Design a protein around this ligand. Structure first.
Ligand SMILES: CN(C)S(=O)(=O)c1cccnc1
Ligand SMILES: [Zn+2]
Length: 140
């Protein structure tokens, strides 16, 4: 579990979005595993605006943050998990690391701020849903 809190926006994994998220929907994309809802209180996070390929992510199934190198966002085949069938996922970054289903929502960060959230795992990789292209998160 986990979210990004930027301005008056909550960014969550689409598959973990709540009824209240859907009732306060700003934007969602199944292909990216992302949903954004509106919040009453302003949040503490800053979104990265960059093309970094090094950062640190939180792994809840290890209670640990890990430094990783990751691929630039692309359109990648993902094998079946407990929460999605085998399918193509867009705007996905991969690194070598540990990721189980419950790790979804952990933050990946670089020197510029939040890069994305854990969205995939298995076979010794961790996959992150990028948010750095979503410039509208910084305003309005
Ligand atoms: C839609 N994209 C912006 S993406 O990140 O899924 C992508 C797709 C193809 C090549 N490189 C990146
Ligand atoms: Zn960066």
């Amino acid at each position: 579990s986990g979210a990004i809190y930027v301005g008056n926006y909550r960014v969550v994994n689409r598959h973990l979005a709540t009824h209240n998220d859907w009732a306060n929907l700003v934007w969602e994309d199944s292909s990216r595993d992302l949903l954004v809802s509106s919040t009453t209180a302003q949040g503490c996070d800053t979104i990265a605006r960059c093309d970094c390929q090094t950062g640190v992510y939180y792994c809840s199934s290890r209670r640990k943050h890990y430094p990783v190198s990751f691929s630039k966002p692309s359109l990648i085949f993902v094998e079946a998990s407990e929460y999605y069938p085998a399918r193509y996922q867009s705007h996905l970054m991969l690194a070598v690391g540990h990721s189980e289903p419950g790790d979804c929502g952990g933050i990946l960060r670089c020197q510029h701020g939040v890069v994305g959230i854990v969205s995939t795992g298995g076979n010794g990789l961790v996959g992150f849903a990028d948010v750095r292209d979503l410039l509208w998160l910084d305003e309005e």
